[PDB]
Design a protein around this ligand. Sequence first.
Ligand SMILES: Nc1ncnc2c1ncn2[C@@H]1O[C@H](COP(=O)(O)OP(=O)(O)OP(=O)(O)O)[C@@H](O)[C@H]1O
Ligand SMILES: Nc1ncnc2c1ncn2[C@@H]1O[C@H](COP(=O)(O)OP(=O)(O)OP(=O)(O)O)[C@@H](O)[C@H]1O
Ligand SMILES: Nc1ncnc2c1ncn2[C@@H]1O[C@H](CSCC[C@H](N)C(=O)O)[C@@H](O)[C@H]1O
Ligand SMILES: [Mg+2]
Ligand SMILES: [Mg+2]
Ligand SMILES: [Mg+2]
Lengths: 291, 394, 424
Amino acid sequence: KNNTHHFPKLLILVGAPGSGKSTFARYFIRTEDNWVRVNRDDFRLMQFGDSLMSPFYEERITKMVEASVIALLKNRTNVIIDATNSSLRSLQDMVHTYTEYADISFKVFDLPVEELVKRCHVTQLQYTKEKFDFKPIPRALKETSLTYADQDTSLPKAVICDLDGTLSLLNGRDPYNASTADQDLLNTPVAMVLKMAKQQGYKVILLSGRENAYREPTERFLAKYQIDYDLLLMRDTNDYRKDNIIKKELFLEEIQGKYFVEFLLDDRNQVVDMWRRELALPCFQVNYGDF
Amino acid sequence: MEDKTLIKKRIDWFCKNKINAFSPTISPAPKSVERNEIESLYEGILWFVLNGVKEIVIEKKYMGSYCDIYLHRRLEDTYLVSRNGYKINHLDQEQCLRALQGLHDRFSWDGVELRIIQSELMPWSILGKGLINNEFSAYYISHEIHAEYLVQSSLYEKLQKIQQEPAYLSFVADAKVLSAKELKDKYPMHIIRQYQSIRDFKFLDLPHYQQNIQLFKRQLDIFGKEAAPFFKPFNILKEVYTDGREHFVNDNLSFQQINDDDFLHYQFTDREDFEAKYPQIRAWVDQVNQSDEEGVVIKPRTAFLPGMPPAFKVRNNDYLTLVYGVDFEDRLQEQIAKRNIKGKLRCSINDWAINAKLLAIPYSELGEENYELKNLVLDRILGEEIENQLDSRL
Amino acid sequence: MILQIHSQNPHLLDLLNKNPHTDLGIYAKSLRNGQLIGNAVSAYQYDVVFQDTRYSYLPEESNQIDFQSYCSPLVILHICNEFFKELLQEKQTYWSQQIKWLERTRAEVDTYPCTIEVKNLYANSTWYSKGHFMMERYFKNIHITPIVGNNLSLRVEGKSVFEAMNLLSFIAVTTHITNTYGEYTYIDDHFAQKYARILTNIPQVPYFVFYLFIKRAIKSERQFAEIKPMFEAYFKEEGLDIDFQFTDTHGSRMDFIVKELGMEYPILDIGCGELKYYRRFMRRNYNYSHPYFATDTDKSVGDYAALLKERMEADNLYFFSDWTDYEYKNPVNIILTEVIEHNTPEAAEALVKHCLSLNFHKMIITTPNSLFNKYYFHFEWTPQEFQDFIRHCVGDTSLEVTYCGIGDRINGETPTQAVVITRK
Ligand SMILES: Nc1ncnc2c1ncn2[C@@H]1O[C@H](COP(=O)(O)OP(=O)(O)OP(=O)(O)O)[C@@H](O)[C@H]1O
Ligand SMILES: Nc1ncnc2c1ncn2[C@@H]1O[C@H](COP(=O)(O)OP(=O)(O)OP(=O)(O)O)[C@@H](O)[C@H]1O
Ligand SMILES: Nc1ncnc2c1ncn2[C@@H]1O[C@H](CSCC[C@H](N)C(=O)O)[C@@H](O)[C@H]1O
Ligand SMILES: [Mg+2]
Ligand SMILES: [Mg+2]
Ligand SMILES: [Mg+2]
């Protein structure tokens, strides 16, 4: 080390109603330099209402709060956050959700209940059981501990390639109508992997989210660009379930336990997540997904 | 001002110092072209009565520097806060404490910790010398010298002679009565220049111009003299008890209590017996005027009414000779048209309304960790920043 | 403004270009709002008054209590170039010139001592911290009488009318450019080279006054270039070779350091309250691609580094206090623009020797010139002293050393010194 390196800050205001956290913040964002406030209550005011809502709404408000904080923290904007939360399951969670993006800090607002209900309510004390110790928590990463899955190394070496948008760019084509798929263009770098792949003992298995009905226009595309493959695995005709569901079935039924997958090449996120997160397998992501 | 980092400084300083009020701008009373009074005693009272304020006080208006006195029971540890937010500490702590026992002795400090009282620290030159010297005395002198010279010299005499000669007049006739941008050009401006420069000279009613300078000189000599420090206290803001509890006074009649055995004033002008009462109040403000004072201040009896300004000031014409020039007296119709107190009044109001909100924080809790205080100060400060851009003769 | 002129000379009124017979001896003309009246009250005495309606010399805007019209050095400045312009001609051109009705040349009629007085002048500056007026130090003919506050009255004495009148105008123009009118303190772009010659028409004005007038009154690089030779020619006549430069030593410096070092090598700033840093990304203009190193013993500077790293723009800024926290083992350009005399003396040799070990491509060092101090109104080296310092630490090695001074040059002496050590 030796070096200076700084990340934005997330300042979590922790405390009860009336305890003066929104007042501090109004002063704070007005005098400090690069700060944005995020209030949960202000959010559920776009949806019209007083500050408790449907477990539908509150789950959606969470989805938004988190997105925004991350959105900003990513932008190197400091974020103060008005935790009406106050618990521990909240706090520890809050910390999990955030620290990796920025340096967390805390500011408590304790205040005698005799004084607290004099900010005019509903006479209700909260879970203030001075826990956790509110020591600042610098940014932490957690994950360079990559651990795959214990696949039988007796089974024959094999790689796995997505077709749509990984070995075969659409070039305008309709995503769901892969009949016109012999016009498709080659993502040569992936093509080049599959080449050198089969130069070592590697079985090359094509696994695709195309209707099986479009098998023929596919085999055309493949032999047109001279792709040397072992299996061609395709989605059942009239299936239409999500990609990762039908690909995973395909994986477990066929590939699984019959081969030893050395890695996978794919494009869209939904699928990459499944491969990595559910099946615990190395998968390289070739372009950008987020379809 | 706006630099976050140094406003942050100023505020911190305000907190550490234990200051508990700021101050309001005070507006002139609204004008009356009718009465040809640029700030009108009448109008300012009427203004109040039509807004429901029917109990009012009228004090003399002291020509000094605004001073919030934080009177403690241990006189020795009192302090002073200026017009805006700052502690005043560059006066002889003795000379001051001495001028403050007068006031201190008018109270009983049993269970009383402190009494925030607003006053005028007198006289002007205690803080204003040199504003007095560099500006006012300078401006006076300039005119005095100039006037003297126009009296003693041959200039005015020689100009009135040429303004009779036959060559001249001929010019002023066949150029005022005849119109062309080349009514030939009687030698390269030569005489077009010279004869146009004369006549476009401003003669001055020399004894008037002197008497007017003398008015200004007079005014300066009332208020501008030095300077044994003393106080005119005019309202108690709050008292604070050792007890822990505080008392928000909110009564502008607290005056006769805290010094000023000076004549206050107090009418319950209810339901326009004002108009019947106005002429008395006028006659009285005239005494204060014919006395040697700046003028008067009109206040509601209840110091803080919601939406109400804190006061209208009504300075006399003679004194305003210090604000506008020597000829303010003459150019009245001009300068009245020119006057506009809306917005001055708008600030006057918010300032005073913030100030009550400030007083509301108990003394015991002024500190750096009180963010209701801090916002309120920053609020007031932004207000300062705005209200400073106004006529500045208000 | 009120201005009486005396002499016992019979042909005064002649010299001032005025006719005592014409309209009672008056000469009138509009000034601004307006009206300026010259007056022969006799020979031996001329009297200029300036009347005014309102706001001739201080913006109507200022809601102030205005009296500039009665005492601003500027009214004087006008009255000169509007009643007495030929009087302010030039040394040669004036003394050798006809008269309306010749009795020889000006050199014969204007030989009688002339006294000129101002009733009320206004000097709001360091140059009249009360008691006295600073040009009294440099001109024995100037006589001040305080009135009140920033106002005084002037009395100017001269051997000739030309000498007297050309001092009054020197007073007016120096007093004005050093004077604050407060928020309305302003100088038009045509000011220089309307008056810039007044500094040259009286004969012992110090260099500092010229510098002052350049930096406070010449708005445009274009216009500085047009006056530059008049100034310099004057100083030649007075026995000094002076270069003059628009930019101001500092920054004239900062300029030199930038153009010399260039952007192709990462900088190592040695003495830094950070200003050299900013300058090195003057927007994209210098597409500065390297990191940027800084050091300083100042705790204050140490902290400000980090106030830019918590974070504003300090992306490639690396700041260090211990010299073993600097580990960058590649080529660097290196800077010492004050530092060596600000203090830490002769450890100054330690510091620079340390630098010469560091893999660099080019060094620049800078110290005051000392031989320059005569020209104004923690040690300090003369160039011989400085050149000796460089010598006895760079010595016996194959380093290429090249000197030059930055800033105005007077007989080869600038106010700032600089070396450029280039490793081969
Ligand atoms: N130090 C103080 N002294 C007096 N009043 C205060 C102080 N601090 C805050 N208040 C007042 O208390 C009230 C509640 O404060 P605030 O709005 O900060 O509550 P909060 O903690 O944000 O509650 P919520 O969870 O509803 O946002 C406000 O009206 C504020 O003006
Ligand atoms: N009886 C009084 N009640 C209130 N204020 C008074 C009184 N007598 C004098 N004053 C002073 O008058 C001031 C307002 O009058 P004045 O016009 O002289 O002040 P100012 O410098 O213009 O201040 P501002 O611009 O804030 O009105 C107050 O700030 C206060 O200092
Ligand atoms: N031996 C040393 N090592 C590191 N820094 C030093 C030093 N000796 C002095 N300094 C620092 O160098 C700084 C120079 S101030 C120079 C500012 C800038 N170069 C300018 O043009 O004015 C001082 O703040 C001082 O604290
Ligand atoms: Mg795909
Ligand atoms: Mg006052
Ligand atoms: Mg001025």
